[PDB]
Structure 1
Amino acid sequence: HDFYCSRLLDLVFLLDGSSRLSEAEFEVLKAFVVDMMEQLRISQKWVRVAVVEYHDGSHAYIGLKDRKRPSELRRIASQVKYAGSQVASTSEVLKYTLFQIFSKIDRPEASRIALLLMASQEPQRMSRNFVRYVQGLKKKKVIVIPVGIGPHANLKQIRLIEKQAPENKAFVLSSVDELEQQRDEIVSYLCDLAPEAPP
């Protein structure tokens, strides 16, 4: 509820759906999202959004073009079923986002951000093309804000990100319990990234 802005934004949520987060802890991540959403004019007109929980392949719950009232979204976002799988390919969800989310460029004047909630580390066999994706994304003016969480956050990937571009600022949290803490600060940095929006 603190500070809260509204802008031309295409915000993508990528939630780690690995076991490195208890079901109980998944909820605290989901909460984090629902808040992030509230602090933003939800509509395919100002701020579009998408929620994807990953591990083996992506699980799209919301899409930028999905037309549903804000109330409706926030709900769905919160009803995202816990996965708890053992693996969560970060390389995969980014390969996915690069080609299945930001393939074409509809709203060219808006900013794009791929909030990447990492809580684990993907099996190295899957990172072969990681960088490609981050590059191909940046090439599409997509900004990636990795948000490490807990002792198993893949820092090298959060670091490789930070340095692919300036806006790729990272954020680390000892746990899910620390999101409600950083929430505001984060959604801030976002505000300062995208162009103002008229009511």
Structure 2
Amino acid sequence: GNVDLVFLFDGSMSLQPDEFQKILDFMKDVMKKLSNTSYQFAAVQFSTSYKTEFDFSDYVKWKDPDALLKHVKHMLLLTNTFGAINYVATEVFREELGARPDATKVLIIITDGEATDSGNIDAAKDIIRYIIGIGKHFQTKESQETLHKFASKPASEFVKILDTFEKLKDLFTELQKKIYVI
């Protein structure tokens, strides 16, 4: 059917400029690959605060991933992931901003650290949640486990741990092998 996908991307101060850019490039690559399909996209940057960089109605109107992410500015603050998930669930998946009432709701969280806030994400229960944890902060098994609370079940399928930012390329390769005409 229809899929309404939101990229929720980390803009924290731990990210070097080239690392932030690789996150952007990954999102653009996925959008370009899936252009003119059944998929619709929205992108939200999160750090201490949250900002919708473009919503579903923007994507439908302009279509161009490069133009849609052209004026993103790296926030450079903390990682309030609990707050960001709640933000998306109540402020982005809304019919007024172009969300389709009959689409499947998907959230892709891209982060390089553990959350600096706390709370619950009960508001996002109906949303399918993928988490991609990248880098040094996720070496220990204990740090990886913290991400499980954000992801859909089972974690083994919805949590992806990449050791370097270069590995987003490999993830994109993997995704492309699962594309089919149905």
Could you say which TM-score interval applies, normalised by the shorter chain? 0.7 to 0.9
Does 1:116 find its partner at 2:104? Answer: no
Q: Name 1:146's counterpart in structure 2.
A: 131
Q: 2:93 aligns with which of 102, 119, 135?
A: 102
For 1:171, the equivalent position in structure 2 comes to: 160
CA 172–10 in structure 1, closer or farther in 2 if over 3 Å, else same: same
Structure 1 unaligned spans of 5+: 1-6
Distance 2:146 2:176 in 1: 22
How much does 1:47 deviate? Answer: 1.9
Task: Give the count of matched residue pairs.
Answer: 174
CA change 1:142–1:58 in 2 (3 A) is same
Match of 2:42 in 1: 50
- Quote the offset at 1:38 in angstroms: 0.7
74 and 10 in structure 1: CA distance in 2 versus 1, 3 angstrom threshold: farther
How far the C-alpha of 1:48 sits from its partner, in A, is: 1.4
Secondary structure at the counterpart of residue 50 of structure 1: strand
The answer to whether 1:28 aligns with 2:28 is no
Tell me the amino acid that sits aligned with residue 52 of structure 1.
V
Distance of aligned partners of 1:122 and 1:160 in 2 relative to their CA distance in 1, 3 Å threshold: closer
The alignment partner of 2:145 has SS state of: helix
Structure 1 residues 95, 187: CA separation in 2 closer, same or farther (over 3 Å shift)? farther
Q: TM-score, normalised by structure 2?
A: 0.81
CA contact 2:4–2:105 (8 Å) conserved in 1: yes
Within-5 A mapping of 1:52-71: 52-66=44-58, 67-71=60-64
Structure 2 gaps, min length 5: none
Residue 38 of structure 1, aligned match among 16, 29, 32: 32
CA distance in 2, matches of 1:31, 1:155: 24
Q: CA deviation at 1:112?
A: 1.6
Alpha-carbon separation, structure 2, partners of 1:34 and 1:76: 9
Question: Contact between 2:112 and 2:137, CA under 8 Å: does it hold in 1?
Answer: yes
Whole-Å Cα distance in 2 between the matches of residues 75 and 178 of structure 1?
25
Deviation at 1:64, TM superposition (A): 1.4
